[PDB]
Design a protein around this ligand. Structure first.
Ligand SMILES: [Ca+2]
Ligand SMILES: [Ca+2]
Ligand SMILES: [Ca+2]
Ligand SMILES: [Ca+2]
Ligand SMILES: [Cl-]
Lengths: 227, 66
């Protein structure tokens, strides 16, 4: 499949923020701090929430995002996590990893913290929604997850990269776990076949903290259109 | 130090990720050394005119051609 880079749905360093403190083509909100080499979507303070969404909807039948990020904290346990979104409407504020609830599309959630106490976190969790489901914060999305994997994305020597691909109605998540500088060292995490999501949507990224707190940094969000 | 050597040095001065290609965001930093709609027109403009294989990038050959 032939991939085209779509700058208008993308951001990255080294000149990420412009001088008025804004990210070109994207709206940020909540606690998000855009610097120039990254956006700290939610910093390591108690009870933060922040987000970054595209200004316009993208109308791609098939696509890929390459999202590079760090989730960093002093402890062996942190919270809450980081979400990557494709959704019919922007979800700038809310209780779901800092973004809005009852969304219509898909969220890929990097869930640092084990609310359901099943010792199966940090974890990466795919959650579809039609505008009627409340994310179940207290069960780490367990009964709502289409697919998932356990992957410790915290406190890594090199940045973590998620590659998220929607091709021919299947959604694949591949993760480079940040153990090495090789940026192509991806491993399979999860896949959802025969998945139907809106034909147009915003791309988004959000994060939040609770009583525990990591810094959630996103270095780049690169969006590609496929054929 | 020839004209072309400077075209080339210029090209790779804006290749911040070192993949030998210039994407829209890279070009945008050159185009601002204005509204987003002005910025979008220019970039869309560059890619329409100069990105032959339609992959979102312009390589040094495509760059020179302008
Ligand atoms: Ca959780
Ligand atoms: Ca759990
Ligand atoms: Ca480049
Ligand atoms: Ca090209
Ligand atoms: Cl940039």
């Amino acid at each position: 499949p032939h991939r085209r880079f779509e700058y208008k749905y993308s951001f990255k360093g080294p000149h990420l923020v412009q001088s008025d403190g804004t990210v070109p083509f994207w709206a940020h909100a909540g606690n998000a701090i855009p610097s120039s080499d990254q956006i700290r979507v939610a910093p390591s303070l108690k009870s933060q929430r922040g987000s970054v969404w595209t200004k316009t909807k993208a109308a791609f039948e098939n696509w890929e995002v390459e999202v590079t990020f760090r989730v960093t904290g002093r402890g062996r346990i942190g919270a809450d996590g980081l979400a990557i979104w494709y959704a019919e409407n922007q979800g700038l504020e809310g209780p779901v990893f800092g973004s809005a609830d009852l969304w219509n599309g898909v969220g890929i959630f990097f869930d640092s913290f084990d609310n359901d106490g099943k010792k199966n976190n940090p974890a990466i969790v795919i959650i579809g929604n039609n505008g009627q489901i409340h994310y179940d914060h207290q069960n780490d999305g367990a009964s709502q997850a289409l697919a998932s994997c356990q992957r410790d994305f915290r406190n890594k020597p090199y940045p973590v990269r998620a590659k998220i691909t929607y091709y021919q109605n299947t959604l694949t998540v591949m993760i480079n776990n940040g153990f090495t500088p090789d940026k192509n060292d991806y491993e399979f995490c999860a896949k959802v076949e025969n998945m139907i999501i809106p034909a147009q949507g915003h791309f988004g990224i959000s994060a939040a903290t609770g009583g525990l707190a990591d810094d959630h940094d996103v270095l780049s969000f690169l969006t590609f259109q496929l054929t | 130090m020839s004209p072309q050597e400077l075209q080339l040095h210029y090209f790779k001065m804006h290749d911040y990720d070192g993949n030998n290609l210039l994407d829209g965001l890279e070009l945008s930093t050159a185009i601002t050394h204005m509204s987003e709609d002005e910025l979008i027109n220019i970039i869309d403009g560059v890619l329409r005119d100069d990105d032959k294989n339609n992959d979102g990038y312009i390589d040094y050959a495509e760059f020179a051609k302008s």
